[PDB]
Amino acid sequence: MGEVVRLTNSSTGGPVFVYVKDGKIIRMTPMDFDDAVDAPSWKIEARGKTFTPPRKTSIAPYTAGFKSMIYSDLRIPYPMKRKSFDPNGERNPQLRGAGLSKQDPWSDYERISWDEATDIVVAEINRIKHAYGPSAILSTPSSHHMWGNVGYRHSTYFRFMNMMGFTYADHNPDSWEGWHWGGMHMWGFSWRLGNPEQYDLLEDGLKHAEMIVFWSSDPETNSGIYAGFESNIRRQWLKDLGVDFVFIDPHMNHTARLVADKWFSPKIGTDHALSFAIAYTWLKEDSYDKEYVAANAHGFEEWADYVLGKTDGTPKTCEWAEEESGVPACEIRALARQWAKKNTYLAAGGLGGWGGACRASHGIEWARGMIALATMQGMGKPGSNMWSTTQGVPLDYEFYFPGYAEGGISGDCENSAAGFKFAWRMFDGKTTFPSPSNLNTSAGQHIPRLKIPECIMGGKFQWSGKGFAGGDISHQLHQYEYPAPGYSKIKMFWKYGGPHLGTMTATNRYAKMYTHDSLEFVVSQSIWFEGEVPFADIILPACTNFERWDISEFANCSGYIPDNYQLCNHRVISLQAKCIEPVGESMSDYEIYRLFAKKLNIEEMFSEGKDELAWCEQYFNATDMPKYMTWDEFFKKGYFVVPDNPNRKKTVALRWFAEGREKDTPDWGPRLNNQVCRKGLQTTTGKVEFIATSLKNFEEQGYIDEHRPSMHTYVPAWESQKHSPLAVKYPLGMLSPHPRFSMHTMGDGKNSYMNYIKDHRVEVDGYKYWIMRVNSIDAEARGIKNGDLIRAYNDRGSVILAAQVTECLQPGTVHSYESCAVYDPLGTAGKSADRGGCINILTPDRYISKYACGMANNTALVEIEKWDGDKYEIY
Amino acid sequence: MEQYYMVIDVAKCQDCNNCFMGCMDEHELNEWPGYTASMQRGHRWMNIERRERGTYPRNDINYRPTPCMHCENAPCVAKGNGAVYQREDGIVLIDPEKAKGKKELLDTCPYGVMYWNEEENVAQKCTMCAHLLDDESWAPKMPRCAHNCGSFVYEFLKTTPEAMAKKVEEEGLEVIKPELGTKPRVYYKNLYRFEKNYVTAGILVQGDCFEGAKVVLKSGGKEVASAETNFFGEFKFDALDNGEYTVEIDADGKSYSDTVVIDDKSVDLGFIKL
Ligand SMILES: Nc1nc2c(c(=O)[nH]1)N[C@H]1C(S)=C(S)[C@@H](COP(=O)(O)OP(=O)(O)OC[C@H]3O[C@@H](n4cnc5c(=O)[nH]c(N)nc54)[C@H](O)[C@@H]3O)O[C@H]1N2
Ligand SMILES: Nc1nc2c(c(=O)[nH]1)N[C@H]1C(S)=C(S)[C@@H](COP(=O)(O)OP(=O)(O)OC[C@H]3O[C@@H](n4cnc5c(=O)[nH]c(N)nc54)[C@H](O)[C@@H]3O)O[C@H]1N2
Ligand SMILES: Oc1cc(O)c(O)cc1O
Ligand code: SF4
Ligand code: SF4
Ligand code: SF4
Ligand SMILES: [Ca+2]
Ligand SMILES: [Ca+2]
Ligand SMILES: [Mo+4]
């Protein structure tokens, strides 16, 4: 009926040009800049060369094949109701997931109208609120979400929920675990949940780098986050400058496979043995920055005595480290010596912080170990810092555009970073108003996402901290309980998405909780019929960001990752055009909430009479965009490339700290009250505390915690091959990092094109099985051959996988990405082997430490064998 | 009469599969009258070959994106009975209609790049997105592979045979299965990473990695390569054809030598303690 039109939109894998014709998406591609209307890029002159980025953006694999997700046959087609669920009769809680237990999920549901679905949910909401109160209504989306600032969970979800309930299952700082519960006590950075700032490090590195140690870092795979492959050319520049790349990772990751000069494969949970031996070498050879340490460290003398083995009787030698990790002593010492004499950047994690190693049983000591090494070598000075090569791009930090974490239309200052700046720009206290919550606050009631199963099935729990405790170093130490004083236990559960079986810990427990009799009602507001969705009583179809209007900036999260758009080669602001009408009978989350608001008699307050596009324009006017173009002009162009700011003075991450002067970067901390005269780290002493003062206070107050000592020491990982009794039955060490070809659950399954990728899933007898990588030696010992179906198991469950025999793992170590989107039990749900590929069924649910209430997934002991075909209904 | 050519740098492939996802995006749900029917899920018009070499801990892996070679002396055209034709710009295309019902076409390929589509009952394969190249509206003026790469692996060009020939010699570009004489127009840079092998090792002196040791590789008595060990005491001689070689090492006046057999496999001699 018409011609092809090129529109714009974006995703968690980067911005794209969307070609549409007759209401159908033809293709989605990376973006080409038009030098006639798009501002010039930045340039960096270093070591006799001029570096400038390509005039184009890049995308991730899962974004390249995203069209197959939009038009997926597993897309929820219309509102659905569980047949065995009668609101006014037998609710049959025990029959939730019955379809799944008989390998026929869809058979459990029947089609219903939007009007009837919403009436049923409203009747439940009102009944529960008047009988138990809003706290009885549990709700939680999950960590990630379709791209788009206005419709993002911190925005639309919170604006509505805050006006309706509710008890939030606040998220644990998954991405940051070790840095959050451990590193924070050592160097502060609470506002970044333990991660360091990275401002202007690219130019610093191009001019001074001689070596980069990628520790638990796979920049190519993770891109930091949301940045496609923007940093690929940068490591290419470094490589051509002669910079050496060393990788320390149990698995020879994708970046290592591409540019590694040397690769170390430590056994799971033993990285801190390597950091202690490196420090030991530096102390014995006097090869570190003593001046820097003398001025910027606290408790270093005592720590040094520990490293030297004076206090515990065990010198942390490279030989001692080899016996612990399996990495040759000579190589550890060689790296140590080279690191000391060359300008070396420590790329801990893919972002500059993070790293799979941080969310493992040794996560706390790994993070502190990374800080210790960077500190000893004088981080902040030219040629020495913590930099993962993904951030640090010289973008205009002075131009302001909100990341999704700043709240959008919710203005929630306690559960989003709206309070820093956006809330004040977006709301005027006259014509438009925020939606605060008096329940999702410390003095109200929330439960830990990691312990939802225990709260539902046990009816009681006690823990430390509330979600992301970034306010101050000690906020995570505050004690909470469920049910909270005066509040009600959960009666209803409103799920937004359903990825937990593949993303949390020892996940069979999440499947078991749905059938508990205390759960009177479960609603799932999702996009695809997968994961946990088939356990709900009512299912509401939401649409992707390609079916609604929104606005956003390439990789811009902001908030707990201030100015992270510096992950990209250009700051790109784009209008997310509604490319097509919603698929099936789905609708945007905002429209769903608008419909509920109407039935709850709060429509005016929630919507303020605005549709998604009206909110986008208001949002737009609250940014610095009006300085360059009007809404009308922006809407027409579709995207804007922020101009370069050539003359701004460079402020390299931590240089101010290294030089003992006032903080001068654009970072959001430390807060003035956490510093003396605007100098020093957020820590009490303002220095890097090898003996954390906050933890010393905590332990002296009576909170004894063996696995989180105030002093950074070699605490044996509780789930490692030589320190866990479990190793006898399950000798193999498994690490389960983020999926290479999917943004967590968003990409896998759904009959998407990504399932045809050779290294994603392997088709065997018509079924595409998840992959587990095994060293040829371990495979041979078990009669396992490439492509064979194997069973990975431990006390927590069984998972059927396709084996990939490789040399990319030290013998004894196995690897399998987490975040499988498919939950496909061979028997009863939560009690049998899964063939979908949910590796997190096997990971430990035990907290990193007694009070460090984070996930320790990446250290799991398992055993594998050729699958005999049984369903193993024994869990 | 300018022709199309593609250059693929093996040393730069990371196997993110942005290409592959790009074909599917372009062909799985779309039909292009005159060029091809929709692609069948599971087909690999763009087939990224994976190859691991060596053994832990001195192993490596390289990838080889493999589309249609659109060779100048194409066997399909020759034995396709008119169901396959060659355009002046070099693109080799299967006639979507004339090819229907002929599974035999698949066997006319020495490279095995065509796949049988069950629903359409026809052979299908790389079209080099001719439908896009033939449309001025497609601003990128290049195929979806090349455009979707985030790793600078592809170099897509339209030039004269002479210009391409010159480029081949300067960059040492190679094609797959040259001996067949089909003359691919898809060239590979650093192909040795995928087709050849290496020998490597780590030299230790008094227990520590030795940097600067002189290493020489000899075949039949004559030097074939040489290098000095890095700070990990390692060296790596790549691009080796199968056969027997001798490695000679000299560190601190201390010598060591040993033979190595390369048979479609790369070898790690391990730690050499001097
Ligand atoms: N073994 C192991 N486990 C790990 C980790 C690890 O390294 N190893 N990594 C950990 C980390 S960092 C994280 S961040 C978590 C991943 O944490 P996540 O919360 O678990 O997982 P996602 O796949 O992002 O799930 C988001 C859900 O929201 C739904 N959704 C997305 N957009 C929308 C929308 O617009 N509307 C609606 N209604 N629904 C939407 C999706 O379909 C999806 O199911 O995994 C953690 N688990
Ligand atoms: N394609 C894709 N990209 C993503 C995501 C995704 O799901 N898919 N997730 C996004 C999100 S939420 C985040 S938080 C970031 C995650 O970013 P990161 O946390 O940086 O992920 P990796 O750094 O690669 O973390 C560990 C790397 O080390 C290995 N590893 C695992 N455990 C250990 C250990 O104990 N020690 C050592 N030395 N190595 C270990 C793994 O093989 C892995 O490649 O990724 C972002 N990028
Ligand atoms: O995965 C993390 C990373 C982010 O950037 C975020 O906003 C929430 C998270 O749990
Ligand atoms: S897109 Fe580029 S790097 Fe990725 S697999 Fe294809 S050629 Fe390789
Ligand atoms: S690779 Fe095969 S299909 Fe392509 S032109 Fe050559 S012989 Fe024909
Ligand atoms: S040139 Fe076009 S048809 Fe050929 S592999 Fe690339 S994307 Fe596919
Ligand atoms: Ca140094
Ligand atoms: Ca490679
Ligand atoms: Mo995360």
CB contact under 8 A, A330 and B139: no
The two three-digit tokens of residue A111, written as one number? 């089609």
Give the three-class secondary structure for A313: coil
Q: Is the C-beta atom of B22 inside 6 A of ligand 6?
A: yes
* Count, residues in chain B: 274
Residues in CB range of A524: below 8 A, 6 or more apart: A495, A498, A532, A533, A535, A536, A538, A539, A540
**Full DSSP string of A521-560:** EEEEEESBS-TTGGG-SEEEEB--GGGS-EEEETT--BTT
B209 a known binding residue?
no
CA distance A773 to B176: 29
Torsion angle defined by CA atoms of residues B129, B131, B136 and B142, in that order, rounded to the nearest 10 degrees: 0
Q: Phi/psi zone of residue A600: left (φ > 0), alpha (ψ -120 to 50 degrees), beta? A: alpha
Of the candidates A508, A737, A409, A539, which has an alpha carbon nearest to the alpha carbon of residue A108? A539
CA distance A533 to A708: 37
CA distance A420 to A415: 12
CB contact under 8 A, A756 and B24: yes
Residue type, A18: V
Residues in CB range of A571: below 8 A, 6 or more apart: A395, A396, A399, A401, A553, A554, A556, A565, A641, A642
CA distance A221 to A251: 13
CA distance B142 to A856: 46
Of the candidates B13, B180, B161, B174, which has an alpha carbon nearest to the alpha carbon of residue B90? B161
Residue type, A251: H
CA distance B187 to B185: 6
CA distance A41 to A394: 10
Chain A residues touching B268 at Cβ < 8 A: none
Torsion angle defined by CA atoms of residues B160, B163, B166 and B172, in that order, rounded to the nearest 10 degrees: -80
Residue type, A750: K
CB contact under 8 A, A220 and B16: yes
Of the candidates A1, A3, A17, which has an alpha carbon nearest to the alpha carbon of residue A638? A17
CA distance A542 to A82: 18
CB-hemisphere CA count at 13 Å for B107? Answer: 3
CA distance A402 to A619: 9
CA distance A801 to A836: 8
10 Å Cβ neighbour count for A835? 24
Closest partner residue to A65 (CB to CB) among B25, B30, B55 is B25
From the CA of A746, give the closest atom in ligand 1: 23
Domains of chain B, first to last: 3-193 (3.30.70.20), 197-273 (2.60.40.10)
Of the candidates A214, A247, A328, A319, which has an alpha carbon nearest to the alpha carbon of residue A276? A319
CB contact under 8 A, B147 and A30: yes
Is-contact A357 A346, C-beta < 8 A? Answer: no
CB-hemisphere CA count at 13 Å for A620? Answer: 26
CA distance A826 to B36: 40
Q: Is residue A166 reached through a cis peptide bond, with omega within 30 degrees of 0 on the bond before it?
A: yes
CB contact under 8 A, A30 and B148: yes
φ and ψ of A748, to 5 deg: -70, 160
Residues in CB range of A740: below 8 A, 6 or more apart: A61, A221, A254, A759, A760, A817, B16
CA distance A258 to B51: 13
φ and ψ of A870, to 5 deg: -70, 160
CB-hemisphere CA count at 13 Å for B9? Answer: 14
Residues in CB range of B268: below 8 A, 6 or more apart: B54, B55, B57, B58, B59, B199, B200, B201
10 Å Cβ neighbour count for B46? 23
Of the candidates A236, A220, A750, which has an alpha carbon nearest to the alpha carbon of residue A527? A750
CA distance B236 to B54: 11
Q: Which residues of A are catalytic, by number?
A: 144, 174, 404
| Closest chain A residue to the Cα of B18, Cα to Cα | A61
Q: First-to-last CA distance in chain A? A: 56
CA distance A79 to A593: 14
CA distance A163 to A105: 33
Domains of chain A, first to last: 37-52+76-168+425-444+487-649 (3.40.50.740), 190-394+652-700 (3.40.228.10), 725-866 (2.40.40.20)
Of the candidates B210, B54, B248, which has an alpha carbon nearest to the alpha carbon of residue A331? B210
Give the three-class secondary structure for A742: coil
A 69-128 residues inside an 8 A Cβ radius of B: 71
CA distance A874 to A795: 10
Of the candidates A28, A3, A13, A2, which has an alpha carbon nearest to the alpha carbon of residue A577? A28
Chain A residues touching B30 at Cβ < 8 A: 26-27
Looking up tokens 């495979």 gives: A779
A24 forms beta bridges with A21
Chain B residues touching A810 at Cβ < 8 A: 56-57
CA distance A821 to A840: 11
The secondary structure element, H or E, covering residue B240 is strand B234-240
Angle value at C-alpha A664, between A659 and A667, nearest 5 degrees = 115
CA distance A784 to A777: 10
| Closest chain A residue to the Cα of B55, Cα to Cα | A807
DSSP state of A261: S
Ligand nearest to the CA of B144: 6
10 Å Cβ neighbour count for A703? 15
CA distance A404 to B225: 55
Ligand nearest to the CA of A550: 1
* Count, residues in chain A: 875
The two three-digit tokens of residue B214, written as one number? 């002189």
Is-contact B35 B189, C-beta < 8 A? Answer: no
Helix, strand, coil percent content, chain A, rounded in steps of 5: 30, 20, 50
Q: Phi/psi zone of residue B252: left (φ > 0), alpha (ψ -120 to 50 degrees), beta? A: left
CA distance A158 to A417: 13
The two three-digit tokens of residue B219, written as one number? 């075949």
Q: Is the C-beta atom of A425 inside 6 A of ligand 3?
A: no
CA distance A398 to A17: 27
Looking up tokens 């290419």 gives: A236
Q: How far is CA A222 from CA A29, A254, A389, A468, in A?
A: 20, 10, 12, 21
CA distance A796 to B142: 50
Residue type, A400: Y
**Buried b / exposed e across A271-284, counting CB within 10 Å, b at 16+?**
bbbbbbbbbbbbbe
Is-contact A530 A750, C-beta < 8 A? Answer: yes
Is-contact A748 A74, C-beta < 8 A? Answer: no
**Distance from the alpha carbon of residue A813 to the mean position of ligand 8, in angstroms:** 22
Give the three-class secondary structure for A10: coil
DSSP E strands, A392-437: none
B47 forms beta bridges with B66
The two three-digit tokens of residue A837, written as one number? 């590929």
CA distance A72 to A723: 45
Rg from Cα positions in chain A: 26
The two three-digit tokens of residue A356, written as one number? 């799979």
Write down the experimental method used for this entry: X-ray
Measured in angstroms, the CA of B70 and the nearest CA of chain A are apart by 24
Alpha helices for A285-382 (secondary structure H): 290-296, 300-307, 318-325, 329-341, 363-376
10 Å Cβ neighbour count for A771? 21
Looking up tokens 């090492």 gives: B249
CB-hemisphere CA count at 13 Å for A808? Answer: 24
Give the three-class secondary structure for A630: coil
CA distance A353 to A196: 7
Task: Give just the sign of the alpha carbon dihedral A818, A820, A825, A826.
Answer: negative
